[PDB]
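Subject: Carbonic anhydrase 2 structure
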Amino acid sequence: HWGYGKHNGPEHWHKDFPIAKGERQSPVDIDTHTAKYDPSLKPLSVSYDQATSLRILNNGHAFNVEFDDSQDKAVLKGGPLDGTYRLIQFHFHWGSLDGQGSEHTVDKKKYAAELHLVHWNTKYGDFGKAVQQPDGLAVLGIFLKVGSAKPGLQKVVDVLDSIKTKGKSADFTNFDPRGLLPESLDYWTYPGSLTTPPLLECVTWIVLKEPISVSSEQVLKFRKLNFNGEGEPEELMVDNWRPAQPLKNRQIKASFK
Ligand SMILES: COC(=O)[C@@H]1C[C@@H](OS(N)(=O)=O)CN1S(=O)(=O)[C@@H]1O[C@@H](COC(C)=O)[C@@H](O)[C@@H](O)[C@H]1O
Ligand SMILES: [Zn+2]
């Protein structure tokens, strides 16, 4: 089944997941001149001080850092959101080259990678119930460009050797995701979807305007990961991004003038 190759990639997904051609699919191009400032947007609240990371996993599509979401330890509130959304995991999408890798684009510009911090709406009790709801998830998206190193990313980078292939995991406790944020929390927001199968239309997207910088050495280590399992022919984990989808009947709102 699905992946990012020529024969199982994004242009094939609709055959197993017809919602791929739905009315609120992600990612999208963010046209900065068409996005409208919305003064009704409340300030974004990112409360990660009590975040409890557990594990990092290569699942054959990306690497995922998982959190304890059995209590309100790390939460996202405010902005366009009603209620409390619990951090469950984060992951990245990245390219084979610095000129591509992000899922969202900004005036058609592609960044080298994109970080997704996934949160679920606690009024639905668990993640599996939340993805069945139009306001079930809030994903915080952060662009990566190549320049100076991101110190808060390095602990992630240095563990990747231990999870090279699909199915491998490692202990990843006491990681502080606050070290992955840019200075500004200015954002764009729109209603959208998961960007991987099952492509469910359950996400409030919050995409930060300010990218973070990571070093060429850091993103090079992303690209040494493997889509395949151990003892299988090596396929480098690169270009695990879905391209921009039609905006259709949606307006992207900006938190800033
Ligand atoms: C809690 O886990 C999740 O939310 C993942 C990531 C999230 O991606 S994103 N691009 O839309 O923010 C999708 N879901 S998911 O539907 O639960 C999760 O994701 C997939 C791949 O996703 C990645 C990035 O590796 C699959 O393997 C899949 O079986 C799904 O259950
Ligand atoms: Zn993602």
